[PDB]
Design a protein around this ligand. Sequence first.
Ligand code: HEM
Length: 154
Amino acid sequence: MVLSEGEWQLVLHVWAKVEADVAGHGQDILIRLFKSHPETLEKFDRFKHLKTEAEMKASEDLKKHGVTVLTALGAILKKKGHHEAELKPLAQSHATKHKIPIKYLEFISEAIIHVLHSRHPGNFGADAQGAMNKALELFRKDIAAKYKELGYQG
Ligand code: HEM
């Protein structure tokens, strides 16, 4: 797929807001993901044991990881589609070491769109949401294609 420059602008315009509080947004997103699709929490040995949303919030570790996740995603979105290099090491670790099915990448994509919707309603109207969804679909499709090359597809 290919986003137009106007869609990329709508995506980097909300993203700039997210960047004013990366650790806060990383936390909200990961907790939204775990509560909604709890089976995902099982992929994290590190976090597995967390039982409630209050324990998740208090975890410093979880918060550092959310900053790592958003920083890696932000660097991919800022490429505006030219992200092949950035995608390589990511696709290799998630397909070979962690073993994350494309399905789960669809669940976190949903968690990102819900949290931006909640926090940034004025900058995340229908068109901007359509543009973010397209950028994440682009990301998922390119990651799926790499997974295939690497021998995991799925
Ligand atoms: C927007 C999507 C995602 C991004 C940009 C992302 C990025 C990262 C990065 C940058 C790291 C550290 C370096 C590495 O291991 O590659 C990481 C580790 C990890 N990720 Fe992801 N990830 C994403 C989605 C997910 C999903 C959906 C799952 C599970 C449902 C997952 C599970 C993990 C695990 C198990 C680790 C290791 C955590 C720890 O250090 O023990 N990731 N991810």
